[PDB]
Amino acid sequence: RPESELIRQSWRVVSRSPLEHGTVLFARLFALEPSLLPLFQYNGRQFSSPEDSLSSPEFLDHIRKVMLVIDAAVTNVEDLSSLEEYLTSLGRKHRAVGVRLSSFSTVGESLLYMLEKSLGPDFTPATRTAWSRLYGAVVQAMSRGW
Amino acid sequence: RPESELIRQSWRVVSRSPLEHGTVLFARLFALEPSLLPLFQYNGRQFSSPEDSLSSPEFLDHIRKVMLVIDAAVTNVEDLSSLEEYLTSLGRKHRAVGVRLSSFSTVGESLLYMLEKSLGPDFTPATRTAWSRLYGAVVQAMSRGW
Amino acid sequence: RPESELIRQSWRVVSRSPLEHGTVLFARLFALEPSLLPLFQYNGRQFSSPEDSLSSPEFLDHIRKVMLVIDAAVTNVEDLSSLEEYLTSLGRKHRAVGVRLSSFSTVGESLLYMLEKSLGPDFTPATRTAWSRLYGAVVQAMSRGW
Amino acid sequence: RPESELIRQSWRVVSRSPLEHGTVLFARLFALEPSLLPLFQYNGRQFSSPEDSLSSPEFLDHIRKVMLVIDAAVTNVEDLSSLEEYLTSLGRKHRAVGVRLSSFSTVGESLLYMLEKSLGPDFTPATRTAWSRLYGAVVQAMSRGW
Amino acid sequence: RPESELIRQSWRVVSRSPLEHGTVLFARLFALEPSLLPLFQYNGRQFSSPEDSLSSPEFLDHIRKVMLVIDAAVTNVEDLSSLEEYLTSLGRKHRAVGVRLSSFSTVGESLLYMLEKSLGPDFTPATRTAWSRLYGAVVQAMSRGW
Amino acid sequence: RPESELIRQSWRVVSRSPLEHGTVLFARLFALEPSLLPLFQYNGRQFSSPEDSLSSPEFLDHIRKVMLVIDAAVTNVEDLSSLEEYLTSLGRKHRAVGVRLSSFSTVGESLLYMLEKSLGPDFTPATRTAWSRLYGAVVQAMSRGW
Ligand code: HEM
Ligand code: HEM
Ligand code: HEM
Ligand code: HEM
Ligand code: HEM
Numbered sequence: 106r107p108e109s110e111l112i113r114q115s116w117r118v119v120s121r122s123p124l125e126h127g128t129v130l131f132a133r134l135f136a137l138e139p140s141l142l143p144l145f146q147y148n149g150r151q152f153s154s155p156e157d158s159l160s161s162p163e164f165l166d167h168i169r170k171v172m173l174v175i176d177a178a179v180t181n182v183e184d185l186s187s188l189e190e191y192l193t194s195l196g197r198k199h200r201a202v203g204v205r206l207s208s209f210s211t212v213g214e215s216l217l218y219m220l221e222k223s224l225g226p227d228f229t230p231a232t233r234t235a236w237s238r239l240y241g242a243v244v245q246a247m248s249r250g251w
Numbered sequence: 252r253p254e255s256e257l258i259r260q261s262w263r264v265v266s267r268s269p270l271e272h273g274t275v276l277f278a279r280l281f282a283l284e285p286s287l288l289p290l291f292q293y294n295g296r297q298f299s300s301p302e303d304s305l306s307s308p309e310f311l312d313h314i315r316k317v318m319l320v321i322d323a324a325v326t327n328v329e330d331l332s333s334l335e336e337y338l339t340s341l342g343r344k345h346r347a348v349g350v351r352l353s354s355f356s357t358v359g360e361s362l363l364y365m366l367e368k369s370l371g372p373d374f375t376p377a378t379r380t381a382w383s384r385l386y387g388a389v390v391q392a393m394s395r396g397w
Numbered sequence: 398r399p400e401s402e403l404i405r406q407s408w409r410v411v412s413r414s415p416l417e418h419g420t421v422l423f424a425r426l427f428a429l430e431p432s433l434l435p436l437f438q439y440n441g442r443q444f445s446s447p448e449d450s451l452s453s454p455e456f457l458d459h460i461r462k463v464m465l466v467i468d469a470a471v472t473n474v475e476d477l478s479s480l481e482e483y484l485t486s487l488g489r490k491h492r493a494v495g496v497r498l499s500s501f502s503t504v505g506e507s508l509l510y511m512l513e514k515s516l517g518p519d520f521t522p523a524t525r526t527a528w529s530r531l532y533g534a535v536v537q538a539m540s541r542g543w
Numbered sequence: 544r545p546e547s548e549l550i551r552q553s554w555r556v557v558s559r560s561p562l563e564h565g566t567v568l569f570a571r572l573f574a575l576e577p578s579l580l581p582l583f584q585y586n587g588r589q590f591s592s593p594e595d596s597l598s599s600p601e602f603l604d605h606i607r608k609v610m611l612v613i614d615a616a617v618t619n620v621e622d623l624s625s626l627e628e629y630l631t632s633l634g635r636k637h638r639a640v641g642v643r644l645s646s647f648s649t650v651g652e653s654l655l656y657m658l659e660k661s662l663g664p665d666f667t668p669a670t671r672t673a674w675s676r677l678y679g680a681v682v683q684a685m686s687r688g689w
Numbered sequence: 690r691p692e693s694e695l696i697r698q699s700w701r702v703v704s705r706s707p708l709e710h711g712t713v714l715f716a717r718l719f720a721l722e723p724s725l726l727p728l729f730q731y732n733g734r735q736f737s738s739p740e741d742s743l744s745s746p747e748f749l750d751h752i753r754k755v756m757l758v759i760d761a762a763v764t765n766v767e768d769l770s771s772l773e774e775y776l777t778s779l780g781r782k783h784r785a786v787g788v789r790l791s792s793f794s795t796v797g798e799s800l801l802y803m804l805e806k807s808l809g810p811d812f813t814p815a816t817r818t819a820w821s822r823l824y825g826a827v828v829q830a831m832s833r834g835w
Numbered sequence: 836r837p838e839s840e841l842i843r844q845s846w847r848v849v850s851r852s853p854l855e856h857g858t859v860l861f862a863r864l865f866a867l868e869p870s871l872l873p874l875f876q877y878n879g880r881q882f883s884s885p886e887d888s889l890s891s892p893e894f895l896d897h898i899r900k901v902m903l904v905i906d907a908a909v910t911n912v913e914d915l916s917s918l919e920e921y922l923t924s925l926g927r928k929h930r931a932v933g934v935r936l937s938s939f940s941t942v943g944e945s946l947l948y949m950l951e952k953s954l955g956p957d958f959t960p961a962t963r964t965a966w967s968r969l970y971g972a973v974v975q976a977m978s979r980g981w
């Protein structure tokens with residue numbers, strides 16, 4: 106894939122500061138779909154507002170985990186089947202905790218939003234399409250699990 | 252069930268003032284999912300904002316009805332099969348008016364939110380888990396209807 | 398004042414259920430001006446969302462207090478100078494806790510909103526103007542205090 | 544259908560200024576379901592806020608297209624099978640771009656909202672029911688496509 | 690002023706469709722400051738949500754009036770003292786209806802937002818600064834009135 | 836001051852990760868007062884949504900600056916007059932860019948919110964009061980400038 110280098114080059118920016126960038130992704134996600142806020146429950150409490158999630162060490166650690174799994178997809182962008190079973194197992198964990206398959210698009214839109222805002226003019230049409238394809242391949246792998 | 256007493260003890264607080272507590276539950280529900288606001292249409296009009304629903308006698312009467320059905324679940328917590336057909340009939344009514352099965356989780360999260368906020372430190376881990384199980388049993392009964 | 402009976406007649410509806418109606422007024426107030434939410438701090442904690450305030454016994458008791466002071470204005474609508482010093486003392490308490498004079502209009506708009514929604518077609522033009530005048534007279538009395 | 548004239552008479556108001564009215568419909572749609580905002584992507588960019596969509600010529604042109612297709616349904620209200628294949632083809636296009644069948648209700652609620660707000664007292668019970676039936680027939684035609 | 694041509698050239702875009710552009714400005718204004726929504730009251734009713742304002746013929750006519758007064762400022766950009774008394778009289782009307790001097794900045798930010806979104810890359814730094822200066826001169830003229 | 840150690844001890848938590856904590860403070864600030872979003876304009880563009888600010892390197896650098904100035908107040912908590920002229924000069928800069936004195940309370944509430952959420956049960960009554968006093972002393976110093 107020639108778009109493998111578009112993904113690698115565009116991820117370098119974000120990968121140097123994964124929590125700041127992941128913070129944009131989750132801020133966007135809760136602005137688009139605040140009904141996902143209750144899925145993140147730590148110490149038996151529900152976040153009242155999206156800004157409450159940003160004060161939780163557990164939640165910020167969850168952001169870091171998400172960013173490491175996207176980073177792994179980037180590392181394996183030229184295949185992606187090297188991570189197939191890890192992603193199917195990650196999908197099984199999602200279904201277990203009550204996440205719906207239909208919510209995948211909103212997370213993808215939040216990731217694309219975060220990339221658009223970080224790269225500016227460098228988030229070219231080809232770069233956008235390459236990320237949509239990567240994300241789609243990741244979600245397909247995770248979808249085996251429902 | 253030993254958690255039957257956790258449910259009964261925790262419901263006494265809320266059951267003494269069902270409209271105030273139900274008001275928290277619906278306020279939370281519309282904050283998490285404002286797309287449910289149009290399902291409550293009285294006198295051929297749509298609520299523009301969540302606060303509009305709180306001014307409607309019909310809507311507040313709907314809150315009271317919801318709270319009485321949760322109260323009935325509490326009264327029958329040691330079985331729950333005593334209410335099985337009433338709940339299946341309630342499920343049929345829901346499908347009829349356009350409510351989706353997928354919205355059950357958001358209502359459950361709103362109920363758990365209302366209980367967390369009312370009980371504070373008394374909403375222990377065991378109490379939380381007991382309510383999730385009760386609510387799950389109620390939704391399972393209602394789900395026969397779609 | 399002939400509008401004294403418009404105020405008395407229109408207040409009877411609301412006065413029979415002061416917490417439900419006051420709940421609409423404060424729900425509207427926080428929807429219009431969420432920056433007022435932090436002024437209501439009980440047990441050293443800030444409400445994260447407007448729906449959090451509706452779960453607080455202290456806050457609901459504050460609503461009841463507000464509704465009793467509007468009720469007192471209605472009781473004294475034919476004069477209003479009978480309550481002048483009580484209202485000036487209430488104004489002093491407001492300035493003390495950090496409330497700004499400029500926020501009076503938003504509270505007035507929330508009260509008028511609550512009355513419009515409760516009375517429907519009975520909230521005639523004359524009724525609206527009578528309430529605006531009463532509220533203005535109340536705020537003038539309270540404004541001595543800043 | 545006798546409600547054919549209720550639909551025609553009520554549409555004349557809106558049809559004279561299709562962009563202003565369509566603007567209400569989409570403003571309502573994004574207020575109820577902001578997660579639909581990312582589906583409208585032009586020039587490789589995502590709208591950050593609903594008000595951003597109203598500044599986009601492409602988006603306003605999309606509103607005009609939607610309003611012309613509702614207008615065509617009105618023109619063919621006495622049958623509706625004259626437009627069956629056009630609507631099935633429109634449904635296929637929707638599935639292609641990632642729109643879910645479940646989102647149809649929210650668009651219907653936004654259309655009914657726009658009609659209620661435009662007609663006021665002229666949006667009688669019979670008029671409301673006639674539009675719900677028309678919209679339902681349109682969505683049924685479009686649903687063949689998923 | 691050499692920035693007189695930057696203002697004239699940038700206004701031509703917007704002036705051809707004043708209601709669509711004014712709609713962006715007011716949508717932005719209510720998103721930034723929803724407490725201004727109650728100031729626009731027609732037929733003795735308050736808008737519950739910003740989208741309600743967009744359904745009101747009176748409100749859309751108010752948008753057109755605002756856009757004509759900005760257009761007049763553009764027409765007189767090389768002086769602006771030709772409109773001094775009209776603007777002072779407009780300021781007096783504002784104070785009368787309860788608008789605060791402090792709200793001028795938010796309206797200016799909404800206008801600049803609308804211009805940024807309409808012009809894109811054509812809303813250069815010099816164009817931005819020229820509009821800020823024009824708007825400031827308009828508000829100074831209107832401020833005599835409080 | 837004995838509350839000097841309450842401030843120092845409570846700041847250690849936050850001072851180790853100033854951007855994450857500052858991010859909570861600004862997220863809260865924009866949730867309470869979205870009309871402050873346009874004051875942060877970089878590269879001649881306005882943030883459409885609060886989440887847009889979190890993607891801006893300039894804005895995140897502004898957060899770091901704010902956190903360093905609060906850190907300086909903590910370092911000088913036993914006097915605070917050691918920073919008097921720096922703070923008066925910072926106040927002059929604020930007035931210059933259009934910030935209002937009245938917005939100080941909302942920033943203080945956002946800071947207290949961030950501290951409450953970071954410390955949990957360690958944000959005792961005495962700790963809360965100590966921070967309110969420090970913040971008040973800072974704002975008093977900055978207020979010379981308007
Ligand atoms: C369908 C949309 C999604 C939703 C609603 C969702 C939500 C969640 C939730 C609620 C958790 C558990 C939180 C906790 O208990 O700490 C979680 C875990 C996680 N998510 Fe997602 N998620 C979605 C998609 C994704 C995607 C697309 C990825 C990246 C490939 C991802 C990466 C992760 C990771 C790495 C974890 C930690 C799993 C573990 O505990 O081993 N998620 N997600
Ligand atoms: C799936 C999530 C739900 C949604 C979206 C929903 C929505 C609705 C709606 C729109 C109505 C009709 C309103 C009216 O016309 O007055 C209704 C009725 C009602 N709901 Fe729900 N509901 C949900 C779940 C529940 C649950 C979990 C309970 C409690 C077990 C419940 C209790 C009731 C009751 C008691 C009624 C009145 C039924 C009757 O007319 O006989 N609902 N609900
Ligand atoms: C200017 C707009 C207003 C704001 C921001 C405001 C806010 C507040 C706050 C923050 C409190 C103290 C809460 C507590 O510690 O429990 C309070 C108390 C109160 N307010 Fe207001 N208020 C406003 C106007 C009014 C008006 C117009 C009335 C009715 C005439 C009113 C009636 C009351 C009453 C009766 C109390 C309780 C006072 C006491 O402790 O003795 N307020 N208000
Ligand atoms: C299920 C709810 C719906 C959603 C989420 C939705 C969303 C969309 C989207 C994302 C597009 C493409 C935008 C673009 O690329 O410019 C579109 C196109 C369109 N929609 Fe919808 N839509 C829905 C239902 C409807 C309905 C009920 C109608 C009217 C019958 C309608 C009329 C149209 C038309 C006429 C187009 C242009 C199609 C073309 O490119 O040929 N949509 N819609
Ligand atoms: C300070 C911020 C402002 C606020 C809160 C505000 C609000 C209002 C309100 C509430 C009205 C009366 C609505 C009605 O009854 O129909 C009005 C009228 C109007 N405004 Fe503003 N406005 C502001 C600034 C401006 C600016 C900067 C301009 C353009 C120079 C402007 C142009 C107009 C015009 C032309 C009218 C119609 C006046 C008339 O009745 O003769 N406004 N405004």
Ligand code: HEM
Nearest residue numbers: 871874875897900901904905928932934935938939942973
């Ligand atoms: C009154 C409420 C406040 C508002 C609305 C406000 C807003 C702003 C704005 C708009 C800027 C300039 C942004 C830029 O161009 O990058 C700024 C700068 C700054 N603010 Fe605030 N601010 C407030 C209070 C405070 C407080 C209480 C502190 C901490 C003591 C603070 C610390 C700073 C610092 C350190 C800077 C950078 C100044 C420089 O350029 O030298 N601000 N603030």
